[PDB]
Amino acid sequence: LKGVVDTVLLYYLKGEVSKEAAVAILEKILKVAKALGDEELIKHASLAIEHVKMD
Amino acid sequence: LKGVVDTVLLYYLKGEVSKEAAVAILEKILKVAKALGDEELIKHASLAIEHVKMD
Ligand SMILES: [Zn+2]
Numbered sequence: 019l020k021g022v023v024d025t026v027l028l029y030y031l032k033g034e035v036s037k038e039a040a041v042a043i044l045e046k047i048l049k050v051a052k053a054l055g056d057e058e059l060i061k062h063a064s065l066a067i068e069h070v071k072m073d
Numbered sequence: 074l075k076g077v078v079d080t081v082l083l084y085y086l087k088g089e090v091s092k093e094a095a096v097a098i099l100e101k102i103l104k105v106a107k108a109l110g111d112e113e114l115i116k117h118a119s120l121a122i123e124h125v126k127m128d
């Protein structure tokens with residue numbers, strides 16, 4: 019679930035996903051990664067979410 | 074200077090430049106951005122730096 023975040027980010031930066039599909043998938047993955055206990059994936063998904071949301 | 078950060082991130086996630094080179098270029102860009110007065114790109118470069126440095 020760490021390569022999925024980078025896959026979504028990479029496909030966003032090439033302009034093949036939108037700010038709507040990407041955020042939906044990344045919040046689903048952050049939900050998975052916050053109920054798993056990983057603090058190294060909570061923050062990974064959080065950084066990806068901040069990048070896709072605003073910037 | 075907003076496309077430079079995305080180019081560095083996109084070439085890092087693609088796994089074809091480096092971790093050292095990406096962080097060096099992004100610290101240069103963050104220095105320019107913090108000596109420009111635009112906090113819309115200060116945090117963009119800071120997020121890219123957090124991603125490349127740690128995750
Ligand atoms: Zn990543």
Ligand SMILES: [Zn+2]
Pocket residue numbers: 069073078079117
């Ligand atoms: Zn960006």
